[PDB]
Amino acid sequence: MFEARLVQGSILKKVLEALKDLINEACWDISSSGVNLQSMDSSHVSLVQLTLRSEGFDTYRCDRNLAMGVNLTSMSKILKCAGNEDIITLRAEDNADTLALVFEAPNQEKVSDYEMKLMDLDVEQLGIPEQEYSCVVKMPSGEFARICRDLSHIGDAVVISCAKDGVKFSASGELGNGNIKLSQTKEEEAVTIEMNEPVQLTFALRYLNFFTKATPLSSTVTLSMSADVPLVVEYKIADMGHLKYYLAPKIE
Amino acid sequence: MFEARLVQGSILKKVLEALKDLINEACWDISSSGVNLQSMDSSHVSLVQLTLRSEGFDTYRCDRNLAMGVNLTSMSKILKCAGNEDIITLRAEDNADTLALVFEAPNQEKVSDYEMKLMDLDVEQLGIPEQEYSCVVKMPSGEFARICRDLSHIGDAVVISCAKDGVKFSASGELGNGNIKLSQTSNEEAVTIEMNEPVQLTFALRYLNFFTKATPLSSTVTLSMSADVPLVVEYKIADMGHLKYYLAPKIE
Amino acid sequence: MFEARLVQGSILKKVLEALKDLINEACWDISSSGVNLQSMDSSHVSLVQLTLRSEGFDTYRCDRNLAMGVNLTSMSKILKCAGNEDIITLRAEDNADTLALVFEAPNQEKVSDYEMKLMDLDVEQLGIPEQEYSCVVKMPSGEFARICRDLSHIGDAVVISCAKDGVKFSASGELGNGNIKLSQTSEEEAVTIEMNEPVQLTFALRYLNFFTKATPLSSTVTLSMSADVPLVVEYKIADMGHLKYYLAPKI
Numbered sequence: 001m002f003e004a005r006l007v008q009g010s011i012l013k014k015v016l017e018a019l020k021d022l023i024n025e026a027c028w029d030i031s032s033s034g035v036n037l038q039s040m041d042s043s044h045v046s047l048v049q050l051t052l053r054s055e056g057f058d059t060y061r062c063d064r065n066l067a068m069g070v071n072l073t074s075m076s077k078i079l080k081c082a083g084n085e086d087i088i089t090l091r092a093e094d095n096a097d098t099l100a101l102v103f104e105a106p107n108q109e110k111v112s113d114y115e116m117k118l119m120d121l122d123v124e125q126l127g128i129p130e131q132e133y134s135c136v137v138k139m140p141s142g143e144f145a146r147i148c149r150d151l152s153h154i155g156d157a158v159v160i161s162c163a164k165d166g167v168k169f170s171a172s173g174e175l176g177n178g179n180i181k182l183s184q185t186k187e188e189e190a191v192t193i194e195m196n197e198p199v200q201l202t203f204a205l206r207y208l209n210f211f212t213k214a215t216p217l218s219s220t221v222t223l224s225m226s227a228d229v230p231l232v233v234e235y236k237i238a239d240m241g242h243l244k245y246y247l248a249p250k251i252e
Numbered sequence: 253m254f255e256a257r258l259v260q261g262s263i264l265k266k267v268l269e270a271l272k273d274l275i276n277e278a279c280w281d282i283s284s285s286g287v288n289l290q291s292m293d294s295s296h297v298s299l300v301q302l303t304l305r306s307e308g309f310d311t312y313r314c315d316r317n318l319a320m321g322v323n324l325t326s327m328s329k330i331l332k333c334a335g336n337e338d339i340i341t342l343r344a345e346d347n348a349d350t351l352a353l354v355f356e357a358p359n360q361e362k363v364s365d366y367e368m369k370l371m372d373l374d375v376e377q378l379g380i381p382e383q384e385y386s387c388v389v390k391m392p393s394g395e396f397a398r399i400c401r402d403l404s405h406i407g408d409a410v411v412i413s414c415a416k417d418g419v420k421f422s423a424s425g426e427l428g429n430g431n432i433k434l435s436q437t438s439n440e441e442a443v444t445i446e447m448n449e450p451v452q453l454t455f456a457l458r459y460l461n462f463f464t465k466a467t468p469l470s471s472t473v474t475l476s477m478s479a480d481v482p483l484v485v486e487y488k489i490a491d492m493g494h495l496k497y498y499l500a501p502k503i504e
Numbered sequence: 505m506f507e508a509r510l511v512q513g514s515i516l517k518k519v520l521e522a523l524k525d526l527i528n529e530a531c532w533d534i535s536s537s538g539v540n541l542q543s544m545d546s547s548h549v550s551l552v553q554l555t556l557r558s559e560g561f562d563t564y565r566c567d568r569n570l571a572m573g574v575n576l577t578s579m580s581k582i583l584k585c586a587g588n589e590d591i592i593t594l595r596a597e598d599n600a601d602t603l604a605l606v607f608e609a610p611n612q613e614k615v616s617d618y619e620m621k622l623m624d625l626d627v628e629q630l631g632i633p634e635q636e637y638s639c640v641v642k643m644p645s646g647e648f649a650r651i652c653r654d655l656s657h658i659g660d661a662v663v664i665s666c667a668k669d670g671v672k673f674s675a676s677g678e679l680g681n682g683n684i685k686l687s688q689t690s691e692e693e694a695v696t697i698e699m700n701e702p703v704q705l706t707f708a709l710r711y712l713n714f715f716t717k718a719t720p721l722s723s724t725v726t727l728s729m730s731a732d733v734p735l736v737v738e739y740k741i742a743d744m745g746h747l748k749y750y751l752a753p754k755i
Contacts, residue, residue, distance in 0.1 A: 143614070150584065150585040150616075151585075153581040153582075153584060153585070154581070154582070154585075154618070175575065175578035175581065175582070175620060175621060176578070176582065176602065176618060176619050176620040176621045177618070177619050178582070178585065178616065178617065178618040178619070179616070179617040179618075180585075180614070180615075180616045180617070181614070181615045181616075181617060182613065182614055183613070183615075185613070191613070
């Protein structure tokens with residue numbers, strides 16, 4: 001028997017917008033520690049990894065560990081029925097085939113109350129080795145979104161060169177080519193770099209533009225890179241957990 | 253001869269948005285009492301009933317009773333050419349085959365001036381057998397819109413249960429099911445109920461979502477229900493008249 | 505070796521929105537006087553004429569006269585990557601097949617830097633002479649846009665009657681017909697007329713609605729007309745140049 005109550009419902013809405021189009025089906029690993037999700041996209045290229053620790057919920061109770069299989073598109077449709085200021089409460093009986101959801105308003109005259117059909121999923125757990133990275137760029141989520149969205153019009157791949165001065169996003173294609181140079185810095189939204197070794201890597205823009213759907217979760221985004229290992233795009237669900245997107249660099 | 257002058261042109265624009273897609277053709281009953289319209293939708297399920305009393309117009313003159321047949325899509329297109337703050341004046345001669353429209357600006361340096369071709373129409377006026385109703389829910393137009401719009405994603409029909417405490421909108425379907433519980437209030441935008449007998453009725457959501465296009469006419473909406481009789485969704489065109497939608501409940 | 509630097513980048517963004525759909529390909533005539541463009545639309549009905557004088561650029565250098573052929577849709581896509589407050593610098597190194605563009609942000613955190621492939625085009629640019637016109641209507645760009653956009657729902661053509669009192673836009677079609685009467689005024693957004701002779705002319709609304717994509721360049725628009733000659737819709741790129749659209753009246 002499971003019962004997590006989250007006051008910032010917006011978090012839960014924003015998460016499923018960032019995921020519904022990248023992954024159709026996924027397995028929610030519920031624990032006393034918190035709510036986890038780990039999955040690869042439809043086409044087995046990018047890896048998603050959600051962590052919502054139990055400290056971050058206003059109430060939390062989890063007697064048995066659940067492994068709820070969910071259609072993320074279906075779950076997104078239900079969370080559309082929640083206002084952004086609503087207090088969302090997840091609940092699941094022990095002997096269960098469904099997840100309940102209860103949206104309370106700010107006024108609390110209104111009380112929405114949904115029940116979602118679950119499903120069977122035999123997806124396999126994956127290894128996320130704890131790797132230290134050469135370059136670690138911290139920048140604003142919106143600027144990373146803007147950049148990835150813009151270079152899409154130029155080309156199908158972005159080349160992220162990274163030095164000590166700043167970071168450089170490049171792209172080539174039919175109509176021409178482009179270079180977006182961002183230097184280090186400042187207050188709130190600032191570009192900062194922890195750089196062991198210089199890195200240059202190529203990534204499909206198609207997939208980065210899926211990751212940037214998480215942009216509403218965080219003012220900042222962190223990109224972590226080393227050669228011959230997957231890029232980690234991390235959006236911090238502040239004071240609560242994270243949403244990490246992993247992506248394999250191209251070989252060319 | 254006919255000449256109604258309405259200062260709040262917006263009213264007339266908002267009306268035809270609420271109707272153009274639900275009914276293609278309709279007969280405008282002009283009278284000394286005011287402008288009326290009564291019609292069933294394309295597919296003979298829902299009944300629409302507009303009343304704009306002559307007290308509510310800033311000028312009003314109607315010598316003979318007219319029965320002007322109108323393509324509501326055509327009339328909508330002309331009212332798009334009116335600004336929201338424009339002063340709209342309807343005018344028609346004796347042996348009429350056309351409706352005039354006159355848009356005066358609030359800057360007063362522009363004067364649009366349209367003429368709309370009318371048409372022949374056969375209208376069998378159903379006796380709307382004015383009833384007293386079991387439940388009469390008054391709530392905010394926007395919340396009714398939100399609710400109907402949301403539950404569409406869950407299912408094809410809404411079940412409006414109504415008690416003394418509040419009102420409960422339910423829906424079932426493929427992905428799961430949902431319940432939106434709205435309670436009454438003490439003390440602008442408030443849920444209030446006049447409840448003779450408890451009522452539970454099912455309605456197609458498809459049609460309620462058509463009715464909610466009238467939402468711009470009024471901050472509040474009133475739902476009136478009794479068993480085995482049609483639901484009345486009433487949007488008040490304040491200090492002027494109303495726009496009522498009738499709908500047949502489903503049969504269990 | 506061309507190098508124009510424009511502080512109001514927005515100008516350059518707004519221009520290419522007003523052009524990309526009307527003309528696919530066009531030839532940019534660069535000169536010491538400034539940047540010019542002259543072209544007819546895809547379907548050889550309307551004539552476009554851009555002038556950006558070199559006084560209006562914050563830096564300007566042009567050693568040789570260039571004739572850069574450009575895919576305006578491609579160039580539009582690059583200018584989307586510029587913010588509205590960005591400082592846009594055009595540059596071309598004459599032993600060249602490409603024009604570079606560099607957008608710096610006002611704060612200068614960021615410096616985007618693009619390079620666009622050019623193309624070969626048959627510079628078949630036959631000019632039209634500086635006519636004096638019967639009616640010259642000056643009105644707000646937004647109202648002209650509104651009017652053209654609205655009457656489209658009524659009909660496929662607008663009849664611009666013009667008198668001393670004001671100006672009258674008419675249209676007929678299936679559902680009915682309409683008349684928008686705008687009178688003159690006695691100072692920001694005002695309708696004013698220089699009227700030698702009275703004029704009535706018909707124009708395809710389809711094309712005027714393409715012209716009104718220039719509306720973001722200017723608070724006002726000027727319509728110039730005489731019988732049996734093309735209508736000039738002029739959007740002033742203030743303190744800098746203009747963007748003129750020419751259109752043949754119906755018969």
